[PDB]
Structure formats: structure tokens, C-alpha cells
Coordinates of C-alpha atoms and ligand atoms in Angstrom, one line a residue:
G1 CA 4.1 -4.2 22.3
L2 CA 4.3 -8.2 21.5
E3 CA 7.9 -8.2 23.0
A4 CA 8.1 -12.3 23.3
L5 CA 7.8 -13.4 19.7
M6 CA 9.4 -10.1 18.3
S7 CA 12.6 -11.1 20.0
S8 CA 11.7 -14.5 19.7
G9 CA 13.2 -14.2 16.7
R10 CA 11.3 -17.5 14.4
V11 CA 9.3 -15.0 12.8
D12 CA 10.9 -12.3 9.9
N13 CA 11.9 -8.9 11.0
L14 CA 9.4 -7.2 8.9
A15 CA 6.6 -8.9 11.4
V16 CA 9.1 -8.4 14.3
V17 CA 8.4 -4.2 13.4
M18 CA 4.6 -5.0 13.1
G19 CA 4.5 -6.0 16.2
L20 CA 4.9 -2.2 17.5
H21 CA 1.7 -2.5 16.9
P22 CA -0.3 -5.5 18.2
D23 CA -3.8 -4.6 17.4
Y24 CA -2.7 -3.4 13.0
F25 CA -0.5 -6.7 14.1
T26 CA -3.1 -9.3 14.0
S27 CA -4.9 -8.1 10.8
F28 CA -2.1 -7.5 9.3
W29 CA -1.3 -11.7 10.1
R30 CA -4.0 -13.7 9.1
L31 CA -4.4 -11.3 6.3
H32 CA -0.1 -12.7 5.3
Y33 CA -0.9 -15.8 6.6
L34 CA -4.0 -16.7 4.2
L35 CA -2.3 -15.4 1.2
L36 CA 1.2 -17.0 1.4
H37 CA 0.0 -20.1 3.5
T38 CA -3.7 -21.0 3.0
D39 CA -5.8 -22.6 0.2
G40 CA -7.6 -20.7 -2.6
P41 CA -7.7 -20.4 -5.7
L42 CA -3.8 -20.0 -6.7
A43 CA -1.3 -22.6 -5.7
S44 CA 1.0 -21.8 -3.4
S45 CA 4.1 -21.6 -5.8
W46 CA 1.9 -19.2 -7.8
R47 CA 1.2 -16.8 -5.2
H48 CA 5.0 -16.8 -3.9
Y49 CA 5.7 -15.5 -7.7
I50 CA 3.3 -13.2 -7.8
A51 CA 4.5 -12.1 -5.1
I52 CA 7.4 -11.9 -6.3
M53 CA 6.4 -9.8 -9.7
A54 CA 5.3 -7.8 -7.3
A55 CA 8.2 -7.4 -5.3
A56 CA 10.3 -6.2 -8.2
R57 CA 9.1 -3.2 -9.0
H58 CA 9.8 -1.6 -6.2
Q59 CA 13.5 -3.5 -6.6
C60 CA 12.5 -5.0 -3.0
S61 CA 14.7 -7.8 -2.5
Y62 CA 13.1 -8.0 1.6
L63 CA 10.3 -9.9 -0.8
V64 CA 11.9 -10.9 -3.8
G65 CA 14.1 -12.9 -1.2
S66 CA 12.2 -14.3 1.1
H67 CA 9.4 -15.0 -1.8
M68 CA 11.8 -16.3 -4.3
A69 CA 12.6 -18.8 -0.7
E70 CA 8.9 -19.7 0.2
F71 CA 8.7 -20.3 -3.9
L72 CA 11.4 -22.9 -3.4
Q73 CA 10.7 -24.4 -0.9
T74 CA 6.4 -25.1 -1.8
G75 CA 8.2 -27.0 -5.0
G76 CA 7.9 -24.6 -7.4
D77 CA 10.1 -24.6 -10.9
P78 CA 13.1 -23.2 -9.8
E79 CA 13.2 -22.1 -13.8
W80 CA 10.7 -19.8 -12.7
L81 CA 13.4 -17.6 -10.6
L82 CA 15.3 -17.1 -14.2
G83 CA 13.2 -14.9 -15.3
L84 CA 9.1 -13.9 -17.2
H85 CA 9.7 -15.5 -19.7
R86 CA 10.4 -18.6 -18.2
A87 CA 7.4 -18.4 -16.0
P88 CA 3.9 -19.8 -17.3
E89 CA 1.9 -16.9 -20.0
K90 CA -1.5 -17.0 -18.3
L91 CA 1.2 -15.3 -15.3
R92 CA 3.2 -13.1 -16.7
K93 CA -0.2 -10.9 -18.4
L94 CA -0.1 -10.1 -14.9
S95 CA 3.0 -7.5 -16.1
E96 CA 1.0 -5.1 -16.7
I97 CA -1.7 -4.8 -14.2
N98 CA 1.3 -5.4 -11.5
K99 CA 3.5 -2.7 -13.0
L100 CA -0.1 -0.1 -12.9
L101 CA -1.2 -1.0 -9.5
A102 CA 1.9 -0.3 -8.1
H103 CA 2.8 2.8 -10.2
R104 CA -0.6 4.4 -11.7
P105 CA -3.5 2.6 -11.0
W106 CA -6.0 5.2 -12.2
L107 CA -5.2 3.6 -15.3
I108 CA -6.2 0.5 -14.2
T109 CA -9.2 -0.2 -17.2
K110 CA -12.1 -2.2 -18.0
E111 CA -9.6 -3.1 -21.2
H112 CA -6.6 -4.5 -18.9
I113 CA -9.3 -6.9 -17.0
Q114 CA -10.6 -7.7 -20.7
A115 CA -7.0 -9.3 -21.4
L116 CA -7.3 -11.5 -18.4
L117 CA -10.1 -12.9 -19.0
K118 CA -9.9 -13.3 -21.7
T119 CA -11.3 -16.9 -22.7
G120 CA -7.7 -18.5 -24.4
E121 CA -5.5 -21.7 -23.5
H122 CA -4.6 -20.7 -19.6
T123 CA -7.1 -18.0 -18.6
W124 CA -7.9 -16.4 -15.2
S125 CA -10.7 -17.0 -13.6
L126 CA -12.8 -14.2 -11.2
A127 CA -11.6 -16.1 -8.2
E128 CA -8.6 -15.8 -9.2
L129 CA -8.1 -12.8 -10.3
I130 CA -9.2 -11.0 -7.3
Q131 CA -6.6 -13.4 -5.6
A132 CA -3.4 -11.8 -7.9
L133 CA -4.7 -8.0 -7.1
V134 CA -4.5 -8.7 -3.5
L135 CA -1.3 -10.5 -3.6
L136 CA -0.1 -8.2 -5.6
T137 CA -1.3 -5.1 -4.1
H138 CA -0.3 -6.7 -0.9
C139 CA 3.8 -7.3 -1.4
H140 CA 3.7 -3.3 -2.8
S141 CA 2.3 -1.9 0.7
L142 CA 4.5 -4.4 2.2
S143 CA 7.2 -3.0 0.0
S144 CA 6.0 -0.1 0.8
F145 CA 6.6 -0.9 4.4
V146 CA 10.1 -2.7 4.3
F147 CA 12.0 0.5 3.1
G148 CA 9.0 3.3 5.1
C149 CA 10.7 1.4 8.4
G150 CA 14.2 0.2 6.6
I151 CA 13.6 -3.8 7.5
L152 CA 16.8 -5.4 7.0
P153 CA 16.5 -8.6 5.9
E154 CA 17.1 -11.8 7.2
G155 CA 20.9 -12.2 5.9
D156 CA 24.4 -12.3 7.7
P168 CA 18.9 -5.3 14.7
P169 CA 15.9 -5.8 12.9
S170 CA 15.3 -2.4 11.2
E171 CA 18.5 0.2 10.4
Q172 CA 16.5 3.4 11.7
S173 CA 13.6 2.1 14.5
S174 CA 15.2 0.2 17.1
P175 CA 13.5 -2.4 19.2
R191 CA 8.2 22.3 20.4
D192 CA 5.9 22.3 17.1
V193 CA 4.2 19.0 18.0
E194 CA 2.6 21.3 21.3
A195 CA 1.7 23.8 17.8
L196 CA 1.0 20.5 15.7
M197 CA -1.5 19.6 18.7
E198 CA -2.9 23.4 18.8
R199 CA -3.8 23.8 15.0
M200 CA -5.7 19.7 15.9
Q201 CA -7.9 21.6 18.5
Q202 CA -9.0 24.5 16.5
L203 CA -10.0 22.5 13.8
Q204 CA -12.5 19.7 16.3
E205 CA -13.6 23.2 17.7
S206 CA -15.5 23.1 14.7
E216 CA -16.2 24.8 -4.8
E217 CA -13.0 25.9 -3.2
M218 CA -12.2 22.2 -1.9
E219 CA -13.2 21.6 -4.9
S220 CA -9.9 23.3 -6.2
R221 CA -7.6 22.8 -3.0
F222 CA -7.3 19.9 -4.0
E223 CA -6.1 20.1 -7.1
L224 CA -3.9 21.9 -5.5
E225 CA -2.4 19.6 -3.0
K226 CA -2.8 17.0 -5.7
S227 CA -0.2 19.0 -8.2
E228 CA 2.1 19.8 -5.6
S229 CA 5.3 17.7 -6.1
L230 CA 7.7 15.7 -3.5
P245 CA 19.0 -4.8 -10.3
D246 CA 19.2 -9.1 -10.2
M247 CA 15.5 -8.3 -9.7
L248 CA 15.2 -6.2 -13.1
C249 CA 13.6 -9.9 -15.0
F250 CA 10.6 -10.5 -13.0
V251 CA 8.8 -7.0 -14.8
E252 CA 7.9 -5.2 -18.0
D253 CA 8.8 -1.2 -18.2
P254 CA 11.2 -1.9 -15.5
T255 CA 11.5 2.6 -15.2
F256 CA 7.3 3.2 -15.1
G257 CA 6.9 5.0 -11.7
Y258 CA 4.5 7.6 -10.2
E259 CA 6.2 10.2 -11.9
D260 CA 6.3 10.3 -16.0
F261 CA 8.8 11.2 -17.6
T262 CA 7.4 10.8 -21.3
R263 CA 5.7 14.7 -20.2
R264 CA 7.3 17.5 -19.0
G265 CA 5.9 19.3 -15.8
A266 CA 4.4 17.3 -12.3
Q267 CA 2.2 14.1 -12.5
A268 CA -1.6 14.2 -11.2
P269 CA -3.5 11.7 -11.8
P270 CA -7.3 12.0 -12.9
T271 CA -9.2 13.6 -10.1
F272 CA -11.4 10.6 -8.6
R273 CA -14.6 11.3 -6.7
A274 CA -14.5 8.6 -4.3
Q275 CA -17.7 8.5 -3.4
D276 CA -18.6 7.4 -6.7
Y277 CA -16.8 3.7 -6.1
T278 CA -16.0 3.6 -1.9
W279 CA -14.8 0.4 -0.4
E280 CA -17.3 0.2 2.1
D281 CA -20.0 0.7 -0.9
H282 CA -18.9 -1.5 -3.9
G283 CA -14.7 -3.0 -3.5
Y284 CA -16.3 -5.1 -0.1
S285 CA -18.7 -6.2 -2.0
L286 CA -17.5 -7.0 -5.1
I287 CA -14.3 -8.7 -3.8
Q288 CA -16.8 -11.1 -1.0
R289 CA -18.3 -12.3 -4.1
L290 CA -14.9 -13.5 -5.7
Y291 CA -12.7 -14.1 -2.6
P292 CA -14.5 -13.9 0.4
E293 CA -12.2 -16.0 3.0
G294 CA -9.7 -12.4 2.3
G295 CA -12.8 -9.9 1.1
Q296 CA -13.4 -9.9 5.1
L297 CA -9.6 -10.0 6.2
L298 CA -9.3 -6.7 4.2
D299 CA -11.9 -4.5 5.3
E300 CA -10.3 -6.0 8.3
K301 CA -7.0 -4.2 8.1
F302 CA -7.8 -1.3 6.6
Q303 CA -10.2 -0.4 9.8
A304 CA -7.6 -1.5 12.1
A305 CA -5.2 0.3 11.0
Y306 CA -7.6 3.8 10.6
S307 CA -8.9 3.7 13.7
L308 CA -5.9 2.4 15.2
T309 CA -5.0 5.1 18.0
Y310 CA -3.5 5.4 21.3
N311 CA -4.7 9.0 21.8
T312 CA -1.1 9.5 21.9
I313 CA 0.6 12.1 20.2
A314 CA 4.1 11.5 20.5
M315 CA 5.2 13.1 24.1
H316 CA 1.0 13.3 25.3
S317 CA -1.4 11.4 26.1
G318 CA -5.5 12.6 26.3
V319 CA -5.2 14.2 22.4
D320 CA -7.5 12.3 20.2
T321 CA -6.2 12.0 16.7
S322 CA -8.3 12.0 14.6
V323 CA -8.2 14.4 12.3
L324 CA -4.4 13.9 11.7
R325 CA -5.2 10.1 10.9
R326 CA -7.5 11.0 8.5
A327 CA -4.7 14.1 7.3
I328 CA -2.4 11.1 6.6
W329 CA -5.4 8.9 4.9
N330 CA -7.3 11.1 2.9
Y331 CA -3.4 12.8 1.6
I332 CA -2.0 9.3 0.4
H333 CA -5.9 8.3 -1.8
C334 CA -5.2 12.0 -3.2
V335 CA -1.8 11.8 -4.2
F336 CA -3.5 8.7 -5.5
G337 CA -6.3 10.8 -6.8
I338 CA -9.1 10.0 -4.6
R339 CA -10.6 13.3 -3.2
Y340 CA -13.7 13.1 -1.1
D341 CA -16.0 15.5 -1.3
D342 CA -16.8 16.3 2.4
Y343 CA -12.7 16.7 3.3
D344 CA -11.2 20.3 3.7
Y345 CA -7.9 19.4 1.8
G346 CA -6.1 22.1 3.2
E347 CA -6.3 20.5 6.5
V348 CA -3.6 18.2 5.2
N349 CA -0.8 21.2 4.5
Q350 CA -2.1 22.8 7.7
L351 CA -1.3 19.0 9.5
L352 CA 1.1 17.5 7.7
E353 CA 5.1 18.7 8.1
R354 CA 7.0 19.2 4.9
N355 CA 9.4 16.1 5.7
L356 CA 6.1 13.9 6.4
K357 CA 4.9 14.6 3.3
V358 CA 8.1 14.2 1.9
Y359 CA 8.3 10.8 3.1
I360 CA 4.4 9.0 3.1
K361 CA 4.6 10.2 -0.7
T362 CA 8.8 9.1 -0.9
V363 CA 7.3 5.6 0.7
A364 CA 4.1 5.4 -1.2
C365 CA 5.0 5.9 -4.5
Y366 CA 9.1 5.6 -4.9
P367 CA 9.9 3.0 -1.3
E368 CA 12.9 2.0 -3.4
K369 CA 14.0 6.4 -2.6
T370 CA 13.4 6.2 1.0
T371 CA 16.7 7.0 3.4
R372 CA 17.5 6.9 7.1
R373 CA 18.3 11.2 6.3
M374 CA 14.5 10.6 5.2
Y375 CA 13.1 9.3 8.0
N376 CA 14.6 10.8 11.0
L377 CA 14.1 14.4 9.3
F378 CA 10.0 14.6 9.7
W379 CA 8.4 14.7 13.0
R380 CA 12.5 14.7 14.7
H381 CA 9.8 14.8 18.2
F382 CA 7.3 12.2 18.0
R383 CA 8.2 8.5 19.0
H384 CA 9.3 6.0 17.0
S385 CA 6.5 3.9 17.0
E386 CA 4.2 6.1 15.7
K387 CA 6.7 7.0 12.9
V388 CA 5.9 3.1 12.4
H389 CA 2.5 4.0 13.0
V390 CA 2.3 6.4 9.7
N391 CA 3.8 3.1 7.8
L392 CA 0.7 1.3 8.4
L393 CA -0.9 4.5 7.6
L394 CA 0.3 4.9 4.2
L395 CA 0.3 0.8 2.9
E396 CA -3.2 0.3 3.7
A397 CA -4.0 3.7 2.4
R398 CA -2.6 2.7 -1.1
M399 CA -3.4 -0.7 -0.6
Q400 CA -7.0 0.3 -0.7
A401 CA -6.0 2.4 -3.6
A402 CA -4.7 0.8 -5.9
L403 CA -7.2 -2.4 -5.3
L404 CA -10.2 0.6 -5.5
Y405 CA -8.9 1.5 -9.2
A406 CA -8.7 -1.8 -10.2
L407 CA -11.9 -3.2 -8.9
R408 CA -14.4 -0.8 -10.0
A409 CA -11.7 -1.8 -13.6
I410 CA -13.6 -5.6 -13.3
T411 CA -17.0 -3.8 -12.0
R412 CA -17.1 -2.1 -15.3
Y413 CA -16.1 -4.8 -17.1
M414 CA -19.1 -6.9 -15.6
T415 CA -21.2 -4.1 -17.6
Ligands
LIG501 C1 -0.7 11.1 15.1 C2 0.6 9.1 14.9 C3 1.2 9.2 15.7 C4 -1.1 8.7 15.8 C5 -0.8 8.4 17.9 N1 0.0 7.6 17.4 C6 -1.7 8.4 17.8 O1 -1.6 7.4 19.4 O2 -3.7 8.3 17.4 C7 -0.2 8.5 13.5 F1 -1.8 9.1 13.0 F2 0.5 8.8 13.4

């Protein structure tokens, strides 16, 4: 870990906890320095205010307070802190797509995109729009991480949760798998399986993953992953429209997926990719992405009930994550590994939210 930096306490609590995984932290920092503290299509103030709007969706005062203050240090019109109504209209057209990216990103559709790029008084460029989707999706994923890891605000420990044998059954069930049409059905099962200043920076403040305008549970339309992967499509679209951070996203996703230490709590010497794949592929399943190679039954085999709850809660309702919830799962796993799960899920989530919105753009582009 980056002990010296972490306890320097010249970087915020969020960044401290990321330090627990230096190989992720580097890719994390590059994107964060970029989005918030480097040139690019939108002015600093706008990038910080966009960050507020995304953070607001999960009532995440860590990121809202933070960005309010950056917005202010960077000479933002302090009147925008009184609510969206005072923001410029261009920045408010973003609310619809902000909401959806946060909660139901599968609902993003060419019309939503065509709304922004609709040539009017102040219009979004694709360059600007892409930066904003990266900004929105980033502060969402960082809201997950913030509640997920119990990250504490700076104003007066750096988390209320981290603090800087079924385990051997799990290692067995991993073994068997690595030793090796109803796959379309197992997906539909797993997907359907069910588990206040800020308000003036949002629309529809109660819109969430779950729909309370329909009886029964929420399950998003199944989407065949390989109609529009990051690898084949979304990356290419971003490096054409927001190159300087297209690569930093492809690098971050790569860094989170492939981050292993070959450790699985007590044990050295293990290949965990099966288990990592299962966390990844599940979270995508929660947002409706079905990979046609995956035996989606591997999920229930490998991810315990409490993990799935925490994961889904951090992904879909991070506001509602709690200490109980945090300890209740993987009782015997190291804290660091708890944090690792957060990395996996934030990147998995961000990628889905993006991919839906990129696909939306690629649709309006035709
Ligand atoms: C299983 C775990 C903890 C990863 C593990 N620390 C590893 O080294 O691969 C992660 F996938 F949650």
C-alpha cells in the first residue's frame, strides 16, 4: 500500500482508501486528475457542477460537499449552489441523462442524446457531451465507492468501516469450475432475483433502480453484451470524441478487472479470476448486460447471499449501505479485499452506464 501518502493527510479520505490498491490507484488518479484538474472541453466550474449533479443522485454529500468547494475555489458562480434553476440551461438539459446513468442506464435512448445535441442557444458538442458522461458516470461510481467503503467527510479515522470456514469451501467451488439455451434462462433468473439539502441539484429525486410504478421487482431489458462491448465499440467512440480520457478509461477498466494478488483471504497461491468474473458479470447482470459465454449459475455458486446484497446495494442504492451490511458478508475476508470488491463493482457499473449511453450516441449518429 501507499502508506506514506495515505497518512500524509494531504489527499482526501477517498483517495486514501484507494491507496490500499496502488495498481488501481494509479489508473484512478490519472482519470481523476484529468476530469477535475486538467484542460478539456468544459470549464473547471462546469466539470465541478456536473460532478455535483451526479453526486446528488445518491445523496452523496462527500462528493457534493467536495465539488461544491472546488466549484467555488475555481470561481464558479456561487449562485448555482442555490439549485439547478440558477444553473445555465445547457447544464440542466443534463439532468435527464444524469438520472438515467445513475439509476436505469438501459433507458438511455437516441432521443435523450438528440435532446442535448439539438442545435439551440447553448448546445452540447459531442466532445463536451462525452466529457460530461464520463464526469457523471465517474461521480456515480465514486458515490458507490464512498458509501461502499464507509468513506468519511473530512470536516470536524478516514473510513467508518475499513481501518488503515466457508472460505475453503469457496476455494473448492472455484477449483471445480477451473478444472473444467438454459444459459439464457439462468440470466433472467439472476437478473430478476431481488435484494437532504442536495435535492435542489436534481430532477425526480426518488427515481431509483426499482420501479414503484409497476408491481413486482425491477429487471431491466436483457441486452446481449456483444452487440456493443467496450472493447469493440465504446472505447473507439470515446477515443474519437474524448481521446485524452478514452485511454484512461480503457486503462482503469483493465486495471480493476485484472487486479489480483492471487490471495483469497487467508490463502496465498490462488487464481481468483473465476470469482472476480462472477462479481463483474453479476453487476452487469443487475444493469442487464448478458455475456453469452457465461454460465450465470456460477454467480450463486461463488457469490454468497450477503455479498450479493452489499454489491447490489452499493451498485443500485449506495445511499442505503451500512456498517452491518458491510461486515455481514465475507466475514473472514481481509478488509482490503472488501475494498477490492468496491473497485470491481464501481468500474463494472460505470462501464455499463457508459456503454448504454455510448450505444445511445452511436444510435443517434446513424
Ligand atoms: C477475491 C478478491 C478478494 C480478489 C483477491 N484479493 C485477489 O487477489 O484476486 C476480490 F475478487 F474480491
